[PDB]
Amino acid sequence: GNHKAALTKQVFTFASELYAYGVREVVISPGSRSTPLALAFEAHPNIKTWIHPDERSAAFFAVGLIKGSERPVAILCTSGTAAANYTPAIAESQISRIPLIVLTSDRPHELRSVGAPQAINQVNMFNNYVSYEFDMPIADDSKETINAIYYQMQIASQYLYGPHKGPIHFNLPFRDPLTPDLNATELLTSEMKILPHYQKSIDASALRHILNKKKGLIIVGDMQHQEVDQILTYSTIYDLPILADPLSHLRKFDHPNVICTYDLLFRSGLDLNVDFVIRVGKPVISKKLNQWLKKTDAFQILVQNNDKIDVFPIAPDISYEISANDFFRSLMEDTTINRVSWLEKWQCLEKKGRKEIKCYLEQATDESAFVGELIKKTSEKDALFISNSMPIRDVDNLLLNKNIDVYANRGANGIDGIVSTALGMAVHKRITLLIGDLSFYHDMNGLLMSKLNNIQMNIVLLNNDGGGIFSYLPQKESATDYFERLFGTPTGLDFEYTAKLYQFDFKRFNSVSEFKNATLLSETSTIYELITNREDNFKQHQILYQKLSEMIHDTL
Amino acid sequence: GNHKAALTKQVFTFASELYAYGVREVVISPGSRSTPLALAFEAHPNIKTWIHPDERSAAFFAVGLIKGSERPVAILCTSGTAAANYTPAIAESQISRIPLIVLTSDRPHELRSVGAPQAINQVNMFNNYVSYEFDMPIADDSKETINAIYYQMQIASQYLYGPHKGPIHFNLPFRDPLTPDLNATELLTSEMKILPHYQKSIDASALRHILNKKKGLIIVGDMQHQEVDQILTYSTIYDLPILADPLSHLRKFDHPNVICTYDLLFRSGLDLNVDFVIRVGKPVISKKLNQWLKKTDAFQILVQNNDKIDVFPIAPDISYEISANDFFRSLMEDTTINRVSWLEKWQCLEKKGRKEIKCYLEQATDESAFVGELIKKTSEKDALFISNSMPIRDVDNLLLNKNIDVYANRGANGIDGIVSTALGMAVHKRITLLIGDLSFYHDMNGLLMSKLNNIQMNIVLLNNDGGGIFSYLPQKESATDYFERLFGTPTGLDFEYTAKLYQFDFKRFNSVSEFKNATLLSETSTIYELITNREDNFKQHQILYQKLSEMIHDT
Amino acid sequence: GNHKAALTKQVFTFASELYAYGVREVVISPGSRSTPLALAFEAHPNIKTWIHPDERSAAFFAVGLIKGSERPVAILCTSGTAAANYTPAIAESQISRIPLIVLTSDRPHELRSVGAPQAINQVNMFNNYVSYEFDMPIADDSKETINAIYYQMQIASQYLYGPHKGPIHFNLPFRDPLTPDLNATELLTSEMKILPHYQKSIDASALRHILNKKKGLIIVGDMQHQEVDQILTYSTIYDLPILADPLSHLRKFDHPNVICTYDLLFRSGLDLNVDFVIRVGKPVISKKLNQWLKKTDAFQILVQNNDKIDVFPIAPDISYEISANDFFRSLMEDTTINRVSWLEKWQCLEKKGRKEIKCYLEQATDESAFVGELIKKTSEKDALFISNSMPIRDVDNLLLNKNIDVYANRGANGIDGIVSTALGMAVHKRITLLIGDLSFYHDMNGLLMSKLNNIQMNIVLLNNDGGGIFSYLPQKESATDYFERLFGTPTGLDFEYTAKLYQFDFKRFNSVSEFKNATLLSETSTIYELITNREDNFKQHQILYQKLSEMIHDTL
Numbered sequence A, C: 001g002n003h004k005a006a007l008t009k010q011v012f013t014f015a016s017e018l019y020a021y022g023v024r025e026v027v028i029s030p031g032s033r034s035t036p037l038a039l040a041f042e043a044h045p046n047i048k049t050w051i052h053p054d055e056r057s058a059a060f061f062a063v064g065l066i067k068g069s070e071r072p073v074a075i076l077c078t079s080g081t082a083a084a085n086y087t088p089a090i091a092e093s094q095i096s097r098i099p100l101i102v103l104t105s106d107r108p109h110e111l112r113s114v115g116a117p118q119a120i121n122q123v124n125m126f127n128n129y130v131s132y133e134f135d136m137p138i139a140d141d142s143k144e145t146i147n148a149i150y151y152q153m154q155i156a157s158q159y160l161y162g163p164h165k166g167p168i169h170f171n172l173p174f175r176d177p178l179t180p181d182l183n184a185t186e187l188l189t190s191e192m193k194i195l196p197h198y199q200k201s202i203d204a205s206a207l208r209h210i211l212n213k214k215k216g217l218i219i220v221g222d223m224q225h226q227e228v229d230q231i232l233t234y235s236t237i238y239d240l241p242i243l244a245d246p247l248s249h250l251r252k253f254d255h256p257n258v259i260c261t262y263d264l265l266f267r268s269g270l271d272l273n274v275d276f277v278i279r280v281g282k283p284v285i286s287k288k289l290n291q292w293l294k295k296t297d298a299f300q301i302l303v304q305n306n307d308k309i310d311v312f313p314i315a316p317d318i319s320y321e322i323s324a325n326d327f328f329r330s331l332m333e334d335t336t337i338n339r340v341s342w343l344e345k346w347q348c349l350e351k352k353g354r355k356e357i358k359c360y361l362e363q364a365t366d367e368s369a370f371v372g373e374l375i376k377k378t379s380e381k382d383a384l385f386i387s388n389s390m391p392i393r394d395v396d397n398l399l400l401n402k403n404i405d406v407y408a409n410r411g412a413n414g415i416d417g418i419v420s421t422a423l424g425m426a427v428h429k430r431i432t433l434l435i436g437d438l439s440f441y442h443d444m445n446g447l448l449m450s451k452l453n454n455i456q457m458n459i460v461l462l463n464n465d466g467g468g469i470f471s472y473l474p475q476k477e478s479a480t481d482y483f484e485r486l487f488g489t490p491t492g493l494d495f496e497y498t499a500k501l502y503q504f505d506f507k508r509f510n511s512v513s514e515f516k517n518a519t520l521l522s523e524t525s526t527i528y529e530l531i532t533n534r535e536d537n538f539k540q541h542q543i544l545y546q547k548l549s550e551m552i553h554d555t556l
Numbered sequence B: 001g002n003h004k005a006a007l008t009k010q011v012f013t014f015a016s017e018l019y020a021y022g023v024r025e026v027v028i029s030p031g032s033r034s035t036p037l038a039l040a041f042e043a044h045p046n047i048k049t050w051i052h053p054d055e056r057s058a059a060f061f062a063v064g065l066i067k068g069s070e071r072p073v074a075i076l077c078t079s080g081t082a083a084a085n086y087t088p089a090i091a092e093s094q095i096s097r098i099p100l101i102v103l104t105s106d107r108p109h110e111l112r113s114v115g116a117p118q119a120i121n122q123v124n125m126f127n128n129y130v131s132y133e134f135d136m137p138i139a140d141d142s143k144e145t146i147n148a149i150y151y152q153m154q155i156a157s158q159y160l161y162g163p164h165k166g167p168i169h170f171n172l173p174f175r176d177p178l179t180p181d182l183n184a185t186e187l188l189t190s191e192m193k194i195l196p197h198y199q200k201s202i203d204a205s206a207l208r209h210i211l212n213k214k215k216g217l218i219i220v221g222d223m224q225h226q227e228v229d230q231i232l233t234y235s236t237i238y239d240l241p242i243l244a245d246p247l248s249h250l251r252k253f254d255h256p257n258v259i260c261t262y263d264l265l266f267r268s269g270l271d272l273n274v275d276f277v278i279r280v281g282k283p284v285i286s287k288k289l290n291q292w293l294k295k296t297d298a299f300q301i302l303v304q305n306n307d308k309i310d311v312f313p314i315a316p317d318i319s320y321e322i323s324a325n326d327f328f329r330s331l332m333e334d335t336t337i338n339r340v341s342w343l344e345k346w347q348c349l350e351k352k353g354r355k356e357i358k359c360y361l362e363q364a365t366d367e368s369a370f371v372g373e374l375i376k377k378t379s380e381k382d383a384l385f386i387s388n389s390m391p392i393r394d395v396d397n398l399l400l401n402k403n404i405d406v407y408a409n410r411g412a413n414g415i416d417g418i419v420s421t422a423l424g425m426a427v428h429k430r431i432t433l434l435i436g437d438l439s440f441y442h443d444m445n446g447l448l449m450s451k452l453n454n455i456q457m458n459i460v461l462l463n464n465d466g467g468g469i470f471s472y473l474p475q476k477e478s479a480t481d482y483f484e485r486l487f488g489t490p491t492g493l494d495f496e497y498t499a500k501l502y503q504f505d506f507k508r509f510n511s512v513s514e515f516k517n518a519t520l521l522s523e524t525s526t527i528y529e530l531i532t533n534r535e536d537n538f539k540q541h542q543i544l545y546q547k548l549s550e551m552i553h554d555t
Ligand SMILES: Cc1ncc(C[n+]2csc(CCOP(=O)(O)OP(=O)(O)O)c2C)c(N)n1
Pocket: A388, A389, A390, A391, A413, A414, A415, A416, A435, A436, A437, A438, A439, A440, A464, A466, A467, A468, A469, A470
């Protein structure tokens, strides 16, 4: 069997070469044309498989496995609309730099024709998002077509780790008959390639005249899956305040120089002249702080550990493509700069601000109170996955010194795929998901992975019956007559039926009090639905956004 | 063994199928990777080859071969930047709807990699301009890789004829070794395909209220390689004036209803009220007429025999995708109205305007005087290829009732590849090329085909040492300190040396008096360089542009 | 009016910010729609313009200015097929990593429509080649239209200098009226931005198990515009032979470990067993050495100082993105071993090989002898620009220890734009061009830059009236009847007329004896045409390709 041999050799060598570069699990979607490679993944004894019927949720689930395992994961689907369902997670992968390996199976080269049944053009179909894309040769007996696997995987490997990391696309034409020879297990190897690892440094001589000024600020944004330890060391030696995003992983250390309440301080009118700012990582969540960067005259230095850097919210004076740890290690040099006065001011504001939050949280009965209680209930060394919209903004204002991790899909900021991404992380981590009802409806299909494979994850569902974030927009007042139809968008759905469909336990609370004396338990994966009111949430959030306004004028 | 026989079969079949759908000649550029299909065309007894070392001029030479033969023509190049040089003529073919078949050879799929030596991405590299692009499978002995030719040639044929006409692209990977079995001549077939022929008609009931209004106008723009006879029939029966562009192929008939001086008329301040206009073809050359279309309140009907209709310069009231003949034929079987005084008003403007042009052409000493003489010197039933920039504007104003044809690359309006396109038509037609010096410089490499292949074609070279069209720009006054350097851009080239290099005879005229008593009949192809001055040309053109202002006010 | 001020503020700020990021030259092509930006470049007192009517040659001319100045250069053209003529130089810039800045002028959105007169789609029209593309907004009075220039310029700057270097695209729509206010000279500023610099390092310990083996080779390909000195330092300490390409810039040092005759050695039948190879830079010219790399089972390391690494001709076992100097200074932490015998075998072969080459050049009378004599004549510390096809193969075989630099277009290996690229380099460096007749005809229009602006550059034209390189192909014997028509392609042109047209001096040599006893350097730029015969060249080259056979007796 000349064809069966070549197809088996190609498909089994490809799966092993994916293993050789770090792939340990794949998410497969059912289909006919994907048969040869699907069987290779299942037969390979060191590649775990996950079968997912929904291609959209499957790709977001794989994004979750990548964020949880810190390894590249591959997805495999058949030809046609299946591949088109990958685009949302591929788009989030592009911005968030997720090493997602997209494999689309195709008809053989001689049979392809755009416009035929189930025949879209798949070659370079993700060109808008990926940095690597290749159309595999058809399998034959020659040595050159096998070496293409080694040749192309070596090129592709530069996009799976380091700063060039991002989604890649292999298009794989397969000729009938499709089923390979399952006896050739000798071609299912488990070798391990040596991966290149670098270390960077910069000469900061021309920068010491800035860094030696007194009123300096370190601003750390999204830093999931990066190391941040040397940021704390530089801050301790040089007395520099750190404004730390929730996704910076820096608030859990309880560092005496970490400022967590900056979004409330700036919202309430904090206005200080600062000499320089060191923006590290992806942008922060705080709308008000990002707007302050577009107004300050401070010297701006941006530090980001990826290629294709974007300088949101404003072009800095210099942009460094380097890891935060390597950057701050180049900056350590004995100097006699006293800025204790500058640091003691920020340490003092943060003290009073942390106190005012605790006073608001004692009298709060709104959605923000529910979020504060979940923060209190989360065990140390555990993790929260926070959905987009308001949950991630409440975490910013409310997470202070708890030793926990928070994760999010803060790349494209979509409300899609949150369930699937959280579940993928729960495969490897102890995580609890916090989500609004619109995102929960968006990726309801994602719960199938919990039902079929018993992935342990509780879900804290905030149900204010629509889009709450829009209450804080000007259209609530300038388009009152159309607000609830265009922006409210209530579903009115009974999510207790969702729990029974996907075999979650269900509990509903109508006040923070019942939530306070309850206990989240890992006996089974359960959905806790907390009922809030969007109008009530807006009123109470307004109270919170101006709580610090008195201390600012008082400290002045 | 099998490889040579599989490669021969695929490549000889592909060449034979191209013949079956209309291809009779190809323009090959040298290279190694293009070996198998290059030898196929040369071996095929009914496919003529042209070998051109400059891929840019080669693609424009193919465009000319298409325009002169009215049959699709293929170009073949090797992998790499050879394919990238095709892009200018591919972009011109997208707008002008030229059925140019673009064949790029590639390395085999298993060896492909963007960034390797001589390795750009050729798959869908012309996606920005073509309506059909295919990456062929590597040659096999199986029937399905051979049937892919029959399958994709049938799909690609819809872009070679009719309204979907335009450029198409095949990327052909070839595996080493690349030489085919030249003795397998049985696979070099010469079948001829039967092809669909349609006729269209529209329901004109909801257009009769417009068409029965008196003050109507038929505006015919670019109609190259299209049939226009029923336009004259409808105009005769219904007393409608025809504002005929030079490229409409209508001015040569000396029809009593064809107005040739509309551009000067509208330049001189014509401001008649019009009930409706029927715009047929691609946009006209006249900037002033296209501005008037953005101002008139007339009912606008657009008629174009091609898909992807663009509606320059303004969206009409209705757009019909139909040939001109099939459009006017569907309106002919109707009753008639009396609009004779409207037709005669226009006929009187044309008679006096033509009399004023004859007067101007006796005094003038500028570039437009040279152009008018060439029209007079052109033998009847012969053709002219007009460059872009000023020459196409001067033909618009000066070509009246002469029985000649005029062609031009009026899609992208590029100054590139003019020489090669003109020579391409010259293989099939009696053609004289009129061209400015900068465009002559641009495609000087295109002259190689005249030397190597003995293409009889004379060249009238209008040399004013720079870009004369920019004299009529507001920058000539508003940016005078920088004008000559930025817009003038003289070369100072002695084009007699170009004539010697490419084995052209040469003659240089400094005045229109010498050119008038000269003769363009030549034993060998020859280059006539006519020396003019850009400022002198600007000043005399402004008199020409305003000449009809007094006669217009006397109507 | 208001439009004239907003337009002026846009183009004057755009041109200044280009200067701020390093642009000093711009090559403008005439057109109407380009008027605003064209006058801005002319009016700017510290940007020099070149005016070129042929966009194809113009873009290759800019490539040469980038190579000569080692700065980014911008090109500007009007709408339509003018931009399409840029494609070949952009393709070469993609592979060779040339920071070519492509500026295409476009109609405003109200007149943007594919199919309209002179209206091709220009936005992302270079998606196939460039690393950055942007469609500028139409100028208006808002500050954000200006701020987009500062924002986008910082992003685009990362593609102009480092390992991410490559062609970038700006499409700029301009609305009538087009003339800017030339009295607003205050907006044409000459600030200079600070640009980041890094130093990388790898952990040599991961390669330890390989680099302690004795039969190791360093193979250095195209390294032009790169630092190369630490390769010599590393090879000296560790006794490693260096096979050096002409474009490696390493042959001009007479380093005891540099091998320049490897190609002839392989052609002459050299067989060798290698423990490891370290491939540095872009691929080597030698077909034999690249074919050998596909057959050896040595451990292979690839090191390139650019992103988007391709691994031609075979997949290495590991590949590093790092400069050669940073890589080898990292390998300098290892202790040495004993491979002195291995080095001696290579040093002895190179000694006899150089004597055999010198012997050949005394006897040869073909195209080869002309090239060998041109190298001898060239002044030291001057430079050659070598065309593709045979001249670059002959320089590989004949260039030994002459103290000169060699440059070429070795990305896409096209025969287009060679003349213009050398001329661009001659503006910043002392260079003589060596080019075959078919490539000379291909870029004949590029000589306009020499007539108009009086660039000093001699041209050595190897005229054999056809494609000489195809003599060495299997087609010469397999399809001999069609060879002259399809591969020879004689033009029969008398290039004395080309010299008169572009105001060059002309001298024609029919014998190597005439050429050896002549003087080339002169006050005026000269075209030296050396008539040779393709058939005799093939035969004499056969003797050269076997001139080193009597030195090879045993496998290395
Ligand atoms: C895929 C996608 N569609 C739409 C949006 C726009 N969007 C942002 S927030 C939001 C509503 C989120 O509602 P919910 O999850 O209930 O949270 P809440 O606003 O109540 O906190 C929408 C539709 C988006 N970000 N992503």
